[PDB]
Structures are given as structure tokens and as C-alpha cells.
Amino acid sequence: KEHQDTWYYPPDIANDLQSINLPAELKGEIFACAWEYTRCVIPNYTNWNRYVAFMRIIIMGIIAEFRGEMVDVTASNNLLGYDLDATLAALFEGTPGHKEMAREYKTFLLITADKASERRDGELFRRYVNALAQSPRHWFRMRDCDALARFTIASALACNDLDDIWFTEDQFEILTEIGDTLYDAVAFYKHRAEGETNSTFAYMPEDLRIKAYSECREILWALDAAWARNPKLANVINFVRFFGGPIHMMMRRYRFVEENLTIGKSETDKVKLWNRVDANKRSVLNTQRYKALIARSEELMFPGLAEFLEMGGDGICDKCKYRESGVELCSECRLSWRKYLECFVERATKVFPELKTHF
């Protein structure tokens, strides 16, 4: 009686992973997911070879997240039978950010694969998690990377052949903050259940979730109005809008249907010993891995991440509870995070002046 999903995807990717022995049902669902994500958050395309590149970037990141052993962006440049530099070139060759985005993506595969493997207990991840909680601006920069937000703004530009359009770093940070805030606001109860740490409103105060969503949505509406008559920038708004919650309704990866076409929770609704032993013998906290990766910070890490890990890896703050061998913010850090959120509107109006010259 109850609908079983059949997986649809274009034949371009249907014979990918010919070298990987995953059940054929699971390949289909990975391919379906990659197609569904692409179409939801990049709904317009002109360049099909770029669209397909992006699909392959998502395929790898799904597999990276499900069996981290398989996807070691440090070890080789051939991942799951794909040429990673070549696939990224297929997407970004001619675009202003190619170099910085290839670094963005490799950081994503590093942290994702390490988070979904024995290397979760390793110095590198430990230092990533502590550096998350360093400041709210740091949190969002790193949240951006975990979600491939600025990476997907670029790929959206790219896939519509908009090879000349780009953004200040301040702008990228506001755009991704809007998307990540929208997404984490909608996904709050799902993140709490499954015990997800990379969630804005696990750090930011819960009492401001509804206002933050309201303001981020209003500002993106404002920003879209300001950019009216420039269909090219409509693709940057589209990424942020569809990413920011709607994909929960549209992609089979999410549970809209299994949860009776509801999102969220009303006010009146209900609320590895041996793996840790045998990992310590294999010296899981590999500092030589960490230092080796800090050495390759021009290849594997986004601009400033190496300096972020070195300064914040052990936690800057004295009263904050950090990860030792996520972060529980102290009350003075909770208040500064709160202050950073509460003045979101000013912060975005500074970086995007066009918001104040409406008519």
C-alpha cells in the first residue's frame, strides 16, 4: 500500500561508481539524491556539462558522509573512480573563484569523511569543532563550508555560464549566513533528535529561531527586489531560497512524506568501547596527519582555515567547555553569539548597501 520510492536521475551519471561495489539500489538513491539536490538549489542551468560536474561533486560528498574510509581527499586525487581536480575543472574552469572553490570542496570532503570515520577522534576534527565555537562569524564561515553554501552560489553562477559574477568575502558570509540560518531554523527539531552538532540554534539561542528565520527571509526578499531586472543574480537568490528549508518538502532524502507532510513540531507536541580501544592503538589522534594537512593548507583548506585551526583548535575562551582527547558555550559567549544574531539586519545592510536605497 505505502509508496516505495523509485529513483530517477539522468543517464549521464547512471554508470558512475562502476568500480565501487555498493548495492545497485543504494547507487540509484545516491544518484537520485544528487539530481534532486542540483535541481532544487540550482533550478536554472545553461551549461549541462557543468550541471553534471556538480552532480558528481554531490555524489562524492554523499558517499564521503556514509562510508568515510572510501573518500580520502588527502590520500589520492582519484575518489570513487572520478578525477577530482578534473571534475572541479569541468565545473569552474573560467570562473573567478575556481582555485578557492576547489579548496572549499576538499575541506568539505576532509571534514565530512573524517566525521564519518575513525578520524572523528583525530586531532584535525577535534580542532575543527573547537574552532567552530571561536566566534559566531567563525561558526557561520565554517557552517558555510559544511553545507557547500558559497561553493553552490559559485556552481549556480557557473552552471548558468555567469563566469564574470562574484562577491566580496563579507557578501559571501551574509548570503551563506541567510541560507544556513534559514536551513538550521527549519531543521532545528531534526538536528536535536539525530544529535547533530553543526546546527546554528544549538549555539544561537532557541528563543531567537523564529525571529532569525523571519529576518533572513525578509532581507533575502529585500535583496531580491534590489536585484530586480538582473535575471543573472536571480540564480544566487534561488540557491539561498530553495536551500533555506524548501528542500525538506521536495527531496526524497528528507522525511516530509514519512512524517505525514508536516515540517517541525507545534508548541503542544511531544519531545563503541572497542572502537575507542582499537582506535587508540592505531593512534587515532594523529598530530602528524594534522601538521601534514596544515602544510597542505594551500590545497585542502579554505583561506583562513589553517590560521583558524591553529589559533582556535584548543579553544580561545577559558569558561567555554571544548572537545578534549560539540562546544558547550559559557554564559558570556552565549550572550555575544546572541548579540551577533540580534544585529543581523545592520550587519547585512552594511555589506549590501542596495538594501537601504529601495523605492
- Residue 79 makes contact with a copy of itself by CB under 8 A: no
CA distance 290 to 306: 10
C-alpha cell at 48: 549541462
Please report where in the chains the cell 566580496 appears, as a residue.
168
Number of residues in contact with a copy of itself under rule CB under 8 A = 63
Q: Smaller CB distance to a copy of itself: residue 161 or 163?
A: 161
Q: Smaller CB distance to a copy of itself: residue 54 or 125?
A: 54
C-beta of 14: minimal distance to a copy of itself in Å? 6
Angle (nearest 5°) at CA 328 between 289 and 306: 30
Please report where in the chains the cell 553554501 appears, as a residue.
149
CA distance 224 to 142: 25
Task: Count Cβ atoms below 10 Å from residue 62 Cβ, excluding itself.
Answer: 17
- Taking CB under 8 A as the criterion, the residue among 44, 275, 283, 287 binding a copy of itself is 44
Which DSSP letter does residue 352 get? -
Rounded to 10°, the helix 98-115/48-66 angle is: 20
C-beta of 192: minimal distance to a copy of itself in Å? 13
Restricting to residues 321-340, name those near a copy of itself by CB under 8 A: none
Query: If we measure between CA atoms, which residue out of 129, 152, 132 comes closest to residue 142?
Result: 132
C-alpha cell at 143: 557552517
What mask, x for binding Zn ion by CB under 5 A, covers residues 289 to 318? Answer: ----------------------------x-
User: Residue 88 is inside which H or E element, if any?
Assistant: helix 84-92
Q: Smaller CB distance to a copy of itself: residue 169 or 259?
A: 259
CA distance 299 to 166: 21
Restricting to residues 243-272, name those near a copy of itself by CB under 8 A: 245-246, 249-250, 252, 257, 259-267, 269
Q: Smaller CB distance to a copy of itself: residue 294 or 351?
A: 351
Binding site for Zn ion (CB under 5 A): 317, 319-320, 330, 333
Binding site for a copy of itself (CB under 8 A): 1-3, 5-6, 8-12, 14, 32, 35-36, 39-40, 43-46, 48, 185-186, 188, 209-211, 213-215, 217-218, 221-222, 224-226, 228-229, 231, 234, 237-238, 241-242, 245-246, 249-250, 252, 257, 259-267, 269, 358-359
